[PDB]
């Protein structure tokens, strides 16, 4: 039982104007996604000082990156506040409509695709390297669920039955053939160095 | 009925840095306010979304910043989600505790205060620059209330009985003898400019 859903127009413009548009510093991509596991962190963390039973499903707060070279994937998995079914599909918990309207319109005045994540539509950036993206998530008032896209304008969502997560998001990132070397980890180090020194939540990076 | 409150220890530590540490850059304060009324009127648009009465307490979402030669102050307002009295409390929505740890720890590896809104807690820095700040705020599911403070280790939380705004907060700046220079038309212009011309909102200027 997968359902399909159309991505709204503006978001469907957006994300083939980020596939499109020749843009050579893809790197950002990894900030944009290290960014929303901190938010998602932050928002955990918050909910908790008020009720410490939140943090039932996991008392650790971490970001992990995963590099897989045999499926050719890296994954971002941190163990924030996740999204409910219903944020999978409002734009997965983003204001993706008007946050592209505003950065269409950043464009129009000189910003480049790097501000992205000053609009609040730093997710889509994952489609500068990835030819799919899988975004595992669960949140403590819903169950697992497993959202994917590869653009096209439709994007899926079903239930997962696999891997228990407790809770959190990881977004798998299925990477286009030729941006491979963001598997690697000599050059994952220098970006996480380069774009989030001074995130507050410990990255682990795995090896192969 | 005014509630005195102690600041936690790591609050009041950041606040005497602030206010202490020889920093030439105070006009960063401006930006980090900005973002928090950025980050607000995000929050509401996704709220509506997928309940348009929330919007009933106004359906304009913007930011004005109304600079006062008379009593020295400048107020950044925006009718953005607001905050609840216990979301005042709990350090005004952010998480200040793990936040200035973070800040702390970064400042030790060459970071500087203008790095302060990368760990949540950019809303201190308004003591850049204020010798005491208020901030009315309203939220839907609450009644308006006055927080206050000039340092000094405590706080205070007030119904406020005056203009019953709607919903939104209002940061009112008491500025410092010295720094009277962000109540220029000309200078806020230029911070505005240099510093969030690509924030998502209209910002208005007030003139006097
Ligand atoms: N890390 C996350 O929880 C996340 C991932 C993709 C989009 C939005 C998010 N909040
Ligand atoms: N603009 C605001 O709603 C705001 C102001 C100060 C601190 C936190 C906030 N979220």
């Known amino acids: 039982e ?45 909910e908790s000082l008020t009720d410490p039973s939140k943090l039932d499903s996991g008392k650790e707060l971490h970001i992990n990156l995963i590099p897989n070279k045999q499926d050719r994937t890296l994954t971002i998995v941190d163990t924030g506040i996740g999204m409910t079914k219903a944020d999978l599909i409002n734009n997965l918990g983003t204001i993706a409509k008007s946050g592209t309207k505003a950065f269409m319109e950043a464009l129009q005045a000189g910003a480049d695709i790097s501000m992205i994540g000053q609009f609040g539509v730093g997710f889509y950036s994952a489609y500068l390297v990835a030819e799919k993206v899988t975004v595992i998530t669960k949140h403590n008032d819903d169950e697992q669920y497993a959202w994917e896209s590869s653009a096209g304008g439709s994007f899926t969502v079903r239930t997962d039955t696999g891997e228990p997560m407790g809770r959190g998001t990881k977004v798998i990132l299925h990477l286009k053939e030729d941006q491979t070397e963001y598997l690697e980890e000599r050059r994952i180090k220098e970006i996480v160095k380069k774009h989030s020194q001074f995130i507050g939540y410990p990255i682990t990076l795995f090896v192969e």
Do not use: G, H, P, W
């Open 2 to 46: 997968v359902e399909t859903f159309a991505f709204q127009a503006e978001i469907a413009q957006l994300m083939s104007l980020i596939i499109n548009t020749f843009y050579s510093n893809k790197e950002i991509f990894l900030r944009e996604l290290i960014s929303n596991s901190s938010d998602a962190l932050d928002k955990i963390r918050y």
